Design a protein around this motif. Sequence first.
Motif, mmCIF file in Angstrom:
data_model
loop_
_atom_site.group_PDB
_atom_site.id
_atom_site.type_symbol
_atom_site.label_atom_id
_atom_site.label_comp_id
_atom_site.label_asym_id
_atom_site.label_seq_id
_atom_site.Cartn_x
_atom_site.Cartn_y
_atom_site.Cartn_z
ATOM 1 N N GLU A 133 -7.587 0.069 -7.036
ATOM 2 C CA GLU A 133 -7.558 -1.100 -7.911
ATOM 3 C C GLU A 133 -8.676 -1.032 -8.939
ATOM 4 O O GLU A 133 -8.454 -1.292 -10.126
ATOM 5 C CB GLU A 133 -7.685 -2.391 -7.104
ATOM 6 N N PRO A 136 -4.596 5.893 -4.798
ATOM 7 C CA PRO A 136 -5.552 5.827 -3.688
ATOM 8 C C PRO A 136 -5.332 7.008 -2.759
ATOM 9 O O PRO A 136 -4.226 7.532 -2.646
ATOM 10 C CB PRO A 136 -5.202 4.504 -2.998
ATOM 11 N N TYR A 137 -6.405 7.442 -2.097
ATOM 12 C CA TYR A 137 -6.280 8.586 -1.191
ATOM 13 C C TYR A 137 -5.283 8.305 -0.067
ATOM 14 O O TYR A 137 -4.425 9.138 0.243
ATOM 15 C CB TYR A 137 -7.640 8.956 -0.602
ATOM 16 N N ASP A 138 -5.401 7.146 0.573
ATOM 17 C CA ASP A 138 -4.524 6.785 1.676
ATOM 18 C C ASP A 138 -4.471 5.269 1.763
ATOM 19 O O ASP A 138 -4.928 4.558 0.862
ATOM 20 C CB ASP A 138 -4.992 7.427 2.990
ATOM 21 N N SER A 139 -3.923 4.772 2.864
ATOM 22 C CA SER A 139 -3.728 3.346 3.059
ATOM 23 C C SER A 139 -4.956 2.644 3.621
ATOM 24 O O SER A 139 -4.878 1.447 3.915
ATOM 25 C CB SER A 139 -2.541 3.114 3.992
ATOM 26 N N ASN A 199 0.398 1.176 9.191
ATOM 27 C CA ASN A 199 -0.840 1.613 8.555
ATOM 28 C C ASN A 199 -1.831 2.058 9.629
ATOM 29 O O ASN A 199 -2.331 1.225 10.394
ATOM 30 C CB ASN A 199 -1.418 0.482 7.691
ATOM 31 N N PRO A 200 -2.169 3.351 9.699
ATOM 32 C CA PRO A 200 -3.041 3.834 10.782
ATOM 33 C C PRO A 200 -4.507 3.455 10.639
ATOM 34 O O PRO A 200 -5.294 3.799 11.527
ATOM 35 C CB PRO A 200 -2.873 5.357 10.704
ATOM 36 N N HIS A 201 -4.908 2.770 9.566
ATOM 37 C CA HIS A 201 -6.313 2.472 9.312
ATOM 38 C C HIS A 201 -6.656 1.008 9.540
ATOM 39 O O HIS A 201 -7.787 0.596 9.269
ATOM 40 C CB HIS A 201 -6.690 2.891 7.890
ATOM 41 N N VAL A 202 -5.712 0.209 10.025
ATOM 42 C CA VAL A 202 -5.999 -1.157 10.426
ATOM 43 C C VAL A 202 -5.401 -1.375 11.807
ATOM 44 O O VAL A 202 -4.476 -0.676 12.228
ATOM 45 C CB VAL A 202 -5.451 -2.200 9.427
ATOM 46 N N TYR A 239 0.837 -1.189 0.000
ATOM 47 C CA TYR A 239 0.000 0.000 0.000
ATOM 48 C C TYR A 239 0.878 1.248 0.000
ATOM 49 O O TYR A 239 1.911 1.270 0.672
ATOM 50 C CB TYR A 239 -0.901 0.069 1.244
ATOM 51 N N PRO A 240 0.500 2.306 -0.705
ATOM 52 C CA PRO A 240 1.138 3.596 -0.449
ATOM 53 C C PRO A 240 0.519 4.229 0.784
ATOM 54 O O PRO A 240 -0.664 4.040 1.074
ATOM 55 C CB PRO A 240 0.831 4.407 -1.719
ATOM 56 N N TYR A 241 1.336 4.983 1.523
ATOM 57 C CA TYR A 241 0.833 5.617 2.741
ATOM 58 C C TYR A 241 -0.282 6.614 2.432
ATOM 59 O O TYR A 241 -1.352 6.578 3.048
ATOM 60 C CB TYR A 241 1.973 6.298 3.496
ATOM 61 N N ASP A 242 -0.045 7.521 1.490
ATOM 62 C CA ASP A 242 -1.059 8.484 1.081
ATOM 63 C C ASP A 242 -0.841 8.786 -0.399
ATOM 64 O O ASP A 242 -0.026 8.138 -1.064
ATOM 65 C CB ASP A 242 -1.019 9.745 1.962
ATOM 66 N N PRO A 302 -7.786 0.313 3.575
ATOM 67 C CA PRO A 302 -7.939 -0.770 2.586
ATOM 68 C C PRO A 302 -9.067 -0.539 1.588
ATOM 69 O O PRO A 302 -8.980 -1.020 0.449
ATOM 70 C CB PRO A 302 -8.191 -2.005 3.463
ATOM 71 N N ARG A 335 -8.600 -9.595 -0.420
ATOM 72 C CA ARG A 335 -9.321 -9.351 -1.666
ATOM 73 C C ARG A 335 -8.462 -8.524 -2.621
ATOM 74 O O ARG A 335 -8.322 -8.869 -3.799
ATOM 75 C CB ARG A 335 -10.657 -8.665 -1.361
ATOM 76 N N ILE A 336 -7.804 -7.488 -2.106
ATOM 77 C CA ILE A 336 -6.941 -6.652 -2.944
ATOM 78 C C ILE A 336 -5.869 -7.496 -3.611
ATOM 79 O O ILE A 336 -5.608 -7.360 -4.813
ATOM 80 C CB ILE A 336 -6.327 -5.510 -2.115
ATOM 81 N N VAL A 385 -7.651 1.768 -1.124
ATOM 82 C CA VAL A 385 -6.743 1.055 -2.014
ATOM 83 C C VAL A 385 -7.538 0.176 -2.973
ATOM 84 O O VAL A 385 -7.162 0.017 -4.143
ATOM 85 C CB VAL A 385 -5.705 0.240 -1.208
ATOM 86 N N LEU A 386 -8.657 -0.392 -2.510
ATOM 87 C CA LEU A 386 -9.507 -1.181 -3.393
ATOM 88 C C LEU A 386 -10.192 -0.292 -4.421
ATOM 89 O O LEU A 386 -10.416 -0.710 -5.563
ATOM 90 C CB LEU A 386 -10.551 -1.955 -2.576
ATOM 91 N N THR A 434 2.267 -1.153 4.306
ATOM 92 C CA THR A 434 2.189 0.217 3.823
ATOM 93 C C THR A 434 3.581 0.841 3.855
ATOM 94 O O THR A 434 4.339 0.648 4.815
ATOM 95 C CB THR A 434 1.200 1.028 4.665
ATOM 96 N N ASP A 487 -5.911 -7.263 8.164
ATOM 97 C CA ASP A 487 -6.397 -6.575 6.965
ATOM 98 C C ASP A 487 -7.013 -7.597 6.028
ATOM 99 O O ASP A 487 -6.416 -7.981 5.012
ATOM 100 C CB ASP A 487 -5.254 -5.812 6.285
ATOM 101 N N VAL A 506 -9.531 -7.150 4.005
ATOM 102 C CA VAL A 506 -9.751 -6.514 2.697
ATOM 103 C C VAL A 506 -8.467 -6.572 1.877
ATOM 104 O O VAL A 506 -8.506 -6.725 0.651
ATOM 105 C CB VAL A 506 -10.258 -5.068 2.871
ATOM 106 N N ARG A 527 -7.282 -9.817 -6.241
ATOM 107 C CA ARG A 527 -7.618 -9.021 -7.419
ATOM 108 C C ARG A 527 -6.365 -8.635 -8.207
ATOM 109 O O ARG A 527 -6.384 -8.637 -9.444
ATOM 110 C CB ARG A 527 -8.409 -7.792 -6.986
ATOM 111 N N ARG A 528 -5.253 -8.342 -7.514
ATOM 112 C CA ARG A 528 -4.028 -7.948 -8.227
ATOM 113 C C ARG A 528 -3.432 -9.105 -9.025
ATOM 114 O O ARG A 528 -2.870 -8.886 -10.102
ATOM 115 C CB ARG A 528 -2.969 -7.396 -7.264
#
Lengths: 474, 474
Positions: free
Chosen positions: B240, B228-231, A338-341, A227-230, B233, A356-357, B236-237, A301, A351, A353, A360-361
């Motif tokens: 994708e 993607p806006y940020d990390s 990663n601050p969102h998980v 993942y990119p950070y932002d 998940p 799935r990512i 990021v999807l 990330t 994570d 999700v 999908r990749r």
Amino acid sequence: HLKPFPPEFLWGAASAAYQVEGAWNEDGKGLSVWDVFAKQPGRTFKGTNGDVAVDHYHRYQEDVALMAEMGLKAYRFSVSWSRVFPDGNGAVNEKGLDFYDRLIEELRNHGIEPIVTLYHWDVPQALMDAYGAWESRRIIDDFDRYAVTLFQRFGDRVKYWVTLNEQNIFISFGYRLGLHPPGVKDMKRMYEANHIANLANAKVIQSFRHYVPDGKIGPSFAYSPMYPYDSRPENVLAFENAEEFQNHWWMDVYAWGMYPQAAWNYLESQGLEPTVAPGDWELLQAAKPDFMGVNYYQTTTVEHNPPDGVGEGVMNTTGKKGTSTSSGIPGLFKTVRNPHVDTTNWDWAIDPVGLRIGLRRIANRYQLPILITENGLGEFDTLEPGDIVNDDYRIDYLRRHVQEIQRAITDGVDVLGYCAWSFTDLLSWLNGYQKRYGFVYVNRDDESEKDLRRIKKKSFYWYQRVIETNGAEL
Amino acid sequence: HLKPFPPEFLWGAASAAYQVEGAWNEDGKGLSVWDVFAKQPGRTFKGTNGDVAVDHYHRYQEDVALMAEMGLKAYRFSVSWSRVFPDGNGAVNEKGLDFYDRLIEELRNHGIEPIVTLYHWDVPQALMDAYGAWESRRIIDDFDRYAVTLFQRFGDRVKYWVTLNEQNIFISFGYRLGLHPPGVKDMKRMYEANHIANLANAKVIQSFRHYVPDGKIGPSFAYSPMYPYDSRPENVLAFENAEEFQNHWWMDVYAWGMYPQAAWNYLESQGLEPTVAPGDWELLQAAKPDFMGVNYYQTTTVEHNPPDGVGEGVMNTTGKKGTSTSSGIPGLFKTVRNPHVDTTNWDWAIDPVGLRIGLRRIANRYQLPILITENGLGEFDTLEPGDIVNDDYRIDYLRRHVQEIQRAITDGVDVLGYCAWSFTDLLSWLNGYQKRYGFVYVNRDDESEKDLRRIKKKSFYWYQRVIETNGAEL
């Protein structure tokens, strides 16, 4: 609106021979590099090693019975190279083959699909003594003979095969981080051994086409999707570098038979790129697999890393949350939390999700069907009065990842099966026994070896229900 | 330590016939769909149209002399199909071919490589009338007859050829947003016309291999790489989904001859996937281009979009900054402002690192050489007394993008050339004349043609110095 899991979906569970089998010196088995490595003082937590492990070599009949009670559609295990050729390249050991023959017959008599993994990190020490194991092209034909031996003996009863399991792990840990046999920290050697392992993978897929034309084979990659950070352009570029260097570096070779060019050029500028011989590209490009195996646990990330910045970093094998530090490659990328998980106490990302990512990749880049060979949650388990292990944490992790698999199938990804890690508790390579992954609790800890009795965890009954409803009830 | 720009790097500038030529009804030219469409009330800003434009048709000698003074290595222009076939598919208009012959001879007499774009949005109106132009398979052989006409007349003098310019724009603006001819707002028809245009692209690449065996040919895709806006998940999807649906949908067909599967399946679930005939996949797969043409202006950042969420958004048409709003596909993704870059007055992101990222993604996914067929900054210019135009804003944008091209080359991306948009100011399709892109200012506005006199901008002399130093001095 979700598609159902396909009717033939391989609901599975997985192990690895050194982590489960024990019987390290019985029935003619030679020594592996992990037999030697784990006995060196300080390599493993409290000295735990695979002499006994969970004693699956003697207790497999009990183990398969619990599989049949659960109703496993598939069981993924690895064959120990040093049981079959104690010397790596010498004479075959019929007793070594006999054990896997008995195991497959036990599985087949209870209606369980065997998924045989050829290599899970246990090359015979003799091959390492004779010529440095994976650093020599000689291992290509010795690994082929080994593989072909298994194909001729089990190909009529085994449809699904995995070649090299987590090649990025045993190459990186074994030749860059120094954490696995051979305990080396040399990037030039790491990429030479990696290239030879790519050629070994390709040679045995090409043999498989001849010896098992009706079977299905693939490598299994330890995939942490980046993942990119932002949306800072400098962080997205770091993600481009990281996904190509950490993931395409292996999967592009598996799928297309080519290394990615930017990564290659970076290694070339460092003097780190592998030696190529006449024949190599044609071999690697001619070994298309039937699926991509995927071992998934977490996403990563990353952010921009200046040319002088973070290099190798601190891992967290203690289990105290927050002790991991950023690792990376100066100039290209470094990791960041990663601050969102949420994370586990080993700072691993939770994570689902991300699965799935990643599915999908792989579909989007390679158009390959996917066999999920490993997914799981490692945690401490308490045995409570009444043979009750209430591992609701494990159920919650597996539930969410299975839910995201169904969404990927609904997106159009062809997922062949799912092998949770693991069926029974097992020996971890470096941290002992207390970080348990199994549906079946095994009665031992780091100090007391006790009786190794099998106890069904709460997650065992959850996953039994998953299989009988084909994933409709999660 | 950067690689130098390669010795024969095509330092270029670009235009398009309807935007530059004028002479809309001279020397036997037939009507194009843009002649008709732009004269419908309300379709274009202040009713501007291509009747005169900046009159390049009569003044091409002056313009080419200015390219020579600049020292242009290549000039990319489009051929007006309605000059060559006034009714699209009948008898050839020799005076139409004779203009492009005069133009090509002027370029070659001044040392300038011509880069001929076959199609830049101006199909003859007669084909629209007869069978609905790109919505009908009849256009495949009509486009082919036109292309071969050009290949036979000019193939001895033109090595570099572009097939369809920004197919994703003229198809989606023409059939999904209704902003371009034929002014249709119908996703099903959009994807049908898009499939037919894919087959037409493949057919003329095939013809090109016969008629110009030593030439180089590719499509020119309007590429906005997604972030993607940020990390998170879910974001990021969204990335994708966005990159596959907006970018892979076209570039995978160009490079591999196949649509991506998740996007296809989503269209199928909505009854929007195109009709496929026997032989379609074989034609598409057997039309490999020599290069991917890339028209690059900006990146696009995306985030999660719930199934009830954003669809069509507001497009900045005026030049008043801050007036754009989110666009997306419900359930897949929606755009959002990248907070880590600046934007022009038309809300286009200024992201030169994005061009490095975009070039890296194409190399990494397709392994194709890239010809950058368009890149530039559209802005208001002030003509100061003394016929002086200080467009430092344009120099700075071009400078930073050329810098990132050289970093991409150093990474290993094979970039063949760079065509700045545009050589002279020209008519924008919908926004009139005041949003200027040229190195060469043209004295006119939306109300008056004035004298159409050519005035070298400061950026003219900057680019002249870039070319003289092969980009070592930016």
